[model samples]
Target: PRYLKGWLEDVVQLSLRRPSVRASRQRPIISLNERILEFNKRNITAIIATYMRKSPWGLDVERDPIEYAKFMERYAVGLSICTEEKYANGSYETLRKIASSVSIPILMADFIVKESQIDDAYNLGADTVPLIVKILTERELESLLEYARSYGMEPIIKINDENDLDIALRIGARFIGICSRDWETLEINKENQRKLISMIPSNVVKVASTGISERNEIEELRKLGVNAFSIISSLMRNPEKIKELIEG
Candidate 1:
């Protein structure tokens, strides 16, 4: 209920602005890259995931996120809180809960179209944010990266094709994730996901995100040098299934 739709950027930004909650600049920043690397020498395959009631993709999910997160706490190194508005339940209610109650790293996974969202992310206690390549404009992409980093949140730049990799790398992305699902649309390219994995350089931390469920696939990806798996609508349900994959 603000201004005229479209072309009025100033009015849009003003309406979205919030009271700046002063940054304390003291909360511990857990390094997802370092954490995954540390677990590389261990027996299990390290994981970071979103625990949502209904998966954005079609999957049978009955368990609640916080309880599931608590159970997964022993197995996973991090948790992603899906902050998109279309999926209303996956919003920040649980994000704040997990940030305060859970020990694992929290990834503010959103289709971030504005700078105001980043402010909300930092204030909500996100350890990191994931910026999907398909959704952000080139200017928004670079500026958001710098803005989030200024808040001490090193974002995971999400990519799909080789073109996305080029942009992400050229713009100084340190943490790159090769996405199985395209963030702009609800389309999946799991078949091509393996191909995109090798395009990423070794120096940048590698994450193969979504659609992977098999234990053998994790092993193969691990062998292929995937540092972490950013899973959603995948490898879910029973802890044993998760254990079977991780306890390699």
Candidate 2:
């Protein structure tokens, strides 16, 4: 009953007073500069990093990708779809469908390394693409960053350690991802996430990913000045946790 049109209309009017849950439906498509401006003025941003296949962490998803994406539209500021070889399950097709199902930005987590792949990401409906500094040479990373910019897609560089953070800063990456899970071992570590996040410059948008599951953890990370969160399994198990994140 709460989800019915009449019920939601009144609820939505009241939601404006709750900034965290307020509507972003009217937000215009803007450059990364404009996006950051909005993020600064709002509460923490939530980016849904949904996985389609069974992951080692037990994050196997069976729902229709489009349906899952639509469910997130109410709470997430954006969606991140990973097309990497190991974790990916029919990425291109699924990404294309998910993009059409939602209006918010779609970030391609393809472990992008080559400049040419930027086109593929954009063509598949990605408004942003991820570049992992741990895998690419400094020169290669910089070149790919340039490519994403030229095509009007923002690049989020994934950093796992201090050196990766340093390289991200050196390359002038405006958006940075601090992944808590090990790329190889598939382990989750919060301490490492805290360490790397503490070193990022204040002006950059710090997106924290993996292992985040509760309101307390979100609040603690908020204290560290992280502006966004990329979550998976936790939200998959308890969809209502999205409300906890917003209310906090």
Candidate 3:
């Protein structure tokens, strides 16, 4: 049985071996704006859009592009990223052109399956990238985490359960994305969100994400002691109104 585990691992790894565009050794253009935010508390605060209050970054993908900008404004979300297809398969030059106007972080929200993609994001000016653990083994995840960090791009790992959280800590992740929505059944459950937030160590700033809309839920998450939350639906429905509420 133990021997079978090794064989199974190899098979899984082989199946997940996705590749990216060829890499060039040329250095990526470091964003002066990103550096400005890196050390300055004010810049980080600006990224969050709210000071000392619960920061709720907006999450958007192409399936619903109508409210993308709205989500960004209402949430004061310092960061956002379009799905790979929407951005023409992570075309760095194109992303840069569109990102020139946005004041917040425009992460390349894609199913990062390779090292080249990580390198590509930094070169193209991605503020952060999502590394979903549901698809990566612990070792592979850590390898990418180190690679993502070396280029000054923050890696926010998304986890759906406690085991995934453990793997994230083992791989040295700081910012986290917690999704309570069930992918299989399309059910939105916050119980898992509460449990995971409670379990994370005090030093880590846990973020409660997915299936949040009710102002009461946001307040409840704050009571649970989460540092931030991410909204997609509530703000998408009425971004301007929500932005006013969050800003005020």
Candidate 4:
């Protein structure tokens, strides 16, 4: 299994590294002096300019590379986020193609340790991106979020606990992802999700993501008061399943 990891990572890059080199022949990398807060302000303003007045929307994009665009269209997806880096083989060009093809919204979901990755995401036409709380300190997360925003792109912060929520609120993040899985051990932690959701302020829109399979569970989660469901496994298991599973 470990040997296979590198193989997959290579696969991800095969698509991204090509066109990027071709485009870079025209302009070398440019540097900027703006701080993270300035960037965050710009991203939030851009998102608000496009979607602030709208109601809640479903967000999903993770799937096979070839099927991604088709899936988004089939679902009438409002936001299509990429998971290229998740497999390590992800290429930026493939990600860019998916982003540029979509009309609604696009988010680049990845580890994103370096500042250069943020710009890379934008260059690929990402409208939003996620910074996981488990990987970075609160200060680091805020700085990254702000930097992402400065480019007029939305920054979505994903958290699994109450303390993380506190950090999100302090940073003035209105969009949040509440995970049903734990980050430290990668275990399912719905109990933590329920507790954290109850404590979060009502003003912020909460998006619930992780392992959900049954339609009834979706409906049940909706009754629990989640504004939107971030599904991955359920669809992978069986894409033909009825939305009635959502019927409570």
After superposition, the stretches of candidate 2 with alpha carbons farther than 4 Å from their true spots are: 1-40, 49-51
3-84: candidate 2 lDDT, tens digit per residue: 3243223333333232221111222333433454476587545545454454545566666777777888777767777664
Stretches of model 3 off by over 4 angstroms after superposition: 1-75, 86-94, 210-212, 245-248
lDDT of 4 by residue, 1-248 (tens): 01223433343344234332223211221211122123333431111101111111222324455354545433322343443433433466666666556554555655555566777777766666777776666777788888987877656678888888888888888677788776444567777787787876766665677355544545565556555555553454444332333322
**Which lDDT values do the candidates have, in the order given?**
0.71, 0.68, 0.56, 0.53
Q: How far off is residue 246 in model 4, in Å?
A: 7.0
Displacement of the residue 186 alpha carbon in candidate 3, Å: 3.3
Give each model a TM-score.
0.83, 0.80, 0.68, 0.67
Q: Highest lDDT: which candidate?
A: 1
Model 2 clash pairs are none
Query: How accurate locally is residue 110 in candidate 1, as Cα lDDT from 0 to 100?
Result: 60
lDDT of 3 by residue, 1-248 (tens): 01223323343343245344443433344332343234233423222321111111223323333234434543454544443442123244544543454545555666576787776666556666778787676777888888888877767788888988998888888777777874334456688878888888765655566334555665676677565555545444544544443444
Q: Give the candidate order by descending lDDT.
A: 1, 2, 3, 4
Clashes of 2: 0
Q: What lDDT does candidate 4 reach at residue 124?
A: 67
Residue 23, candidate 1: Cα error in Å is: 9.1
User: After superposition on all CA atoms, how large is the RMSD of candidate 1?
Assistant: 4.8
Locate the minimum summed-lDDT window of 10 residues in model 4. Answer: 47-56
